[PDB]
Amino acid sequence: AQGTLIRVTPEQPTHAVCVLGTLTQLDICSSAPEDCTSFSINASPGVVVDIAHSSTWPLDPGVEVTLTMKVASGSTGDQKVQISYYGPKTPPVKALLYLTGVEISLCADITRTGQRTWTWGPCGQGAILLVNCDRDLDSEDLQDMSLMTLSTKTPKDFFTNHTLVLHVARSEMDKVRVFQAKCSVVLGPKWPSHYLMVPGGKHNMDFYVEALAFPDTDFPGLITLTISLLDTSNLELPEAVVFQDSVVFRVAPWIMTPNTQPPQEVYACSIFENEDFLKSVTTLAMKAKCKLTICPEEMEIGYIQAPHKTLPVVFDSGPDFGYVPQTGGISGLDSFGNLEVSPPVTVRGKEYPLGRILFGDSCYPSNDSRQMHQALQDFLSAQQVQAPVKLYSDWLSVGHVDEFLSFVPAPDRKGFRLLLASPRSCYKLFQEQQNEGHGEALLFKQQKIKNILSNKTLREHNSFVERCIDWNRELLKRELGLAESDIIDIPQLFKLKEFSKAEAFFPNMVNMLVLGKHLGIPKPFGPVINGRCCLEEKVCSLLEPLGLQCTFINDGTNVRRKPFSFKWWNMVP
Amino acid sequence: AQGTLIRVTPEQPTHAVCVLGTLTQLDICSSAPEDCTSFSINASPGVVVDIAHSSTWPLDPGVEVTLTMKVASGSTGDQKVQISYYGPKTPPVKALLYLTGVEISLCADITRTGQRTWTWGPCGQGAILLVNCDRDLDSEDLQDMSLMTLSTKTPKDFFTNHTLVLHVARSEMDKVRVFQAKCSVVLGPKWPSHYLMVPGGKHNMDFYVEALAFPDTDFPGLITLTISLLDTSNLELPEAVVFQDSVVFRVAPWIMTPNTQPPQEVYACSIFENEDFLKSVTTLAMKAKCKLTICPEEMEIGYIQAPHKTLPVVFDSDFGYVPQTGGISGLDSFGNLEVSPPVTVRGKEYPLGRILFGDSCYPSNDSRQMHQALQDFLSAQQVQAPVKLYSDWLSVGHVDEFLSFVPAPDRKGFRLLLASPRSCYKLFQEQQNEGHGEALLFKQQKIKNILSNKTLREHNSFVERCIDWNRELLKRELGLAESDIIDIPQLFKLKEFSKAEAFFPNMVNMLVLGKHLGIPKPFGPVINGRCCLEEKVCSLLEPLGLQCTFINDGTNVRRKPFSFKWWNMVP
Ligand SMILES: [Ca+2]
Ligand SMILES: [Ca+2]
Ligand SMILES: [Ca+2]
Ligand SMILES: [Ca+2]
Ligand SMILES: [Ca+2]
């Protein structure tokens, strides 16, 4: 989409190359005869002589004469444009421009079906470049590299005194590698440029391209590759550019999946107690008709997608899988237990269709505060698909948001319910039992119901924790566009610790495995009332009516899930 | 403007703090008697109870009740909400909430005329920070600082068991220092937080914030400062957050100025005699009514503007100031940097200009490029988006050797001058055909001998190809037309590595002090008494209003900011 200028002189004939599709400006005035106010152009039927305001159209100060051609040329110097400068002095003098048509096309998957700028939206243009972070040769490799096409319809002797170059910038060299289809090293991290060898006539050359980096602060995510026609007709002067065509790719980002998407594969380890646990997980996986891949003998699995492949990726701190400082900046808040993703959301008009990442930190910097490493936050922010949200999770001894918040599948409203821990519903549930007579039922050491409702230290300890969780509630009701009819509160008692940090009293029921629309909740080991645990009766009476089904286990599991449907390139960040 | 949630229990009365202007949610269902189906709220004339589906509003699963007050409190627990639950077979029970009003305002110059998000445009909201790069004491210092205000209207006993804290992130700490008005050192590069001391009643505290960094790749340009109202009523439990307000600043960028802006003050360097040079400069310098400050016995001067001050800047490799160890290339000098006048490209408007720097056409082993750090620095400043050109074919690598922009009274109000080897040959040929073809040039040579050298006529054809490439690049990326490109005669020659060099002194590298132009001497052919190149350039430039002189050729010219407020442009 970038050509050059053609100046015609009556003194000598001129030779020029016009690439088909490019509107080439013809200078018909700077080199005109001394006196004249007229000019005309009789061209061959293959030359489109466009003019902007024969008919002798006068030599306007600026008269934009542009020229394109229709049929590519195999004859070198065939289409002849002859000008007629007739002013007032003798029959007109005439100038000759012996042109030629060539067709250098660099096509790709810009239409995103599978301007030279990358645009987002249901209507835009752009190519997608996946990263090679997996171990798979031949076709299997051909199916995850991109496919650029270079067609060259040129005269037979055109490439005797012309040459083509395909080059990247010296900033993007290390983030992209290209192979010329056998597949061969063309450009790459050490070589910034390459010259090509193209025979005359029609010769199509297909390229394959891989990225070697994920988007970050140093790398926005856009790569550009350029083809240029360097005219080389004299061996004593440097080469000259006559045409340039570029293309822009965007590297696909790291996308994380929440607990509403249907499961695909589950995993586990061998602490030699699973028999009791794995026996219920194994039943659950086939309750939802899933696959349970046991593993015989801190990890988050997302998906990176292009129009041609949906390769998954693993992140931590095989064939269809993937991978993305250890010394310094190490704390307990750097774990992926401090990372969650909300379901698709709509906040004050804007639509977040892939979710909104959630990580926890402190409320205000101090000397004893803990934070997640800035490198990880910058990495997650560079992935503009899921804009992260900062919460408060430093009042806890561990430092993880998964202690108090979860999301469930649901068949109503936004199609999900936010489960939040609640110290205030446990006290209510205990008091409804004390005011009915059975107030000496034992809990869990072991303690009665009354001895927990008559402890004035635990009550303050839990009032503080409730004041802490309500802040996150308010944060989640404004940055997730939520409403009260979508929050369910699950009873949970807390106690404080070294450095007055919080720790759950009985094992959390908010950190639970959603291997489907019916799931696994850790045992409360709570009071028994009428042959049944009271906490269990309340959580099953709040969750089941939506349509879920709940089990209870005593208590590692990762549930690889289904990539989202919304194509990330159709979103407008 | 965050706030929190208040939960009411019939068992015990509840106390809460409601900051003014924040819509606070009230939980009237989670903790209600198990037999109720109806509820009502009687409150003092100050509590604005807002109910969205005593009228008996039933206990809907999501009946929402939000509260605000239309006043301020100086007494703890002075507004009492009494929620009247009505039992079906039981006399009504009633929860008590003892509210209080406190006002905590953190205001700044967000209206940009003097949401917690920084928005661009004529209708946006944001505050602007200027960088501390001047040697300016207190009186002038408070002139370029920011002015953030914090007003607190609280009961006298409120700040006994409550504490206020102002904090910055552990990333933006190194790029902002905070002073509290006597100015004192509080939150800055080494200290990330500060607990304040506020007396009860009315007490306004002003702050002054300065930045220490320019926008770059590592720093987008936005700095947030947060005020948090905590609660320390119990001495054993950890402190708890009750309210949060925030403000977002943007650091003003580095802006350059083109050759179409009026001059303010020229400069010079008496390295040599240059008596003639100085005379001519001062002459057209007072002719354009611009003061000529001389030096007593490569540097680009921009402007960092804010809604409170337009302090300039100086960039190199009072006033203002802004690296790579070494091994850099000559393409890193500032003769490679130019700025176009405001343009309108395909509907889009660039009202501060569009920067221009040259580099190679395609990377190679012998190619030379401008350092990546400088390009990233310029790209960080989104006001003037740079444009890459081709200048590697020269033996110096500077775009100033063929392009220039002049003032003009027509069309876009300017003309782009480009060097042209093809007009020098034309004028020489007209002067040979007319008869005076043995006039001597500048190793002296005649007109005929230059027109009959076949090594030069190829050296010049290559340069013409390169300059036409640059012309197409400048017509598409600057929205230009062929009625705005005046071509200036110039001949070139090739040297070691086949790089290019001007033959006669470059007349396209000119000093523009308004309608007066110091064009370097061409030392060229004389015809009928005057020089031919001079006659041509005075016949092409003068008609549109300019006036020319010919010195025998360092002068920098500080100028006028376009005054077009950038915060009104939307990049
Ligand atoms: Ca490989
Ligand atoms: Ca998680
Ligand atoms: Ca200072
Ligand atoms: Ca100052
Ligand atoms: Ca310059």
Numbering used by the authors:
A (entry chain B): 2 to 54, 65 to 125, 136 to 157, 172 to 216, 224 to 339, 351 to 370, 386 to 392, 396 to 515, ...
B (entry chain A): 2 to 54, 65 to 125, 136 to 157, 172 to 216, 224 to 339, 351 to 370, 388 to 392, 396 to 515, ...
The authors write:
Enzyme activity also depends on calcium ion concentration. A PAD4 monomer has five binding sites for Ca2+, and its saturation results in conformational changes, leading to maturation of the active site (14–16). The calcium-binding sites remained unresolved, even in our 10 mM CaCl2 structure of PAD4.
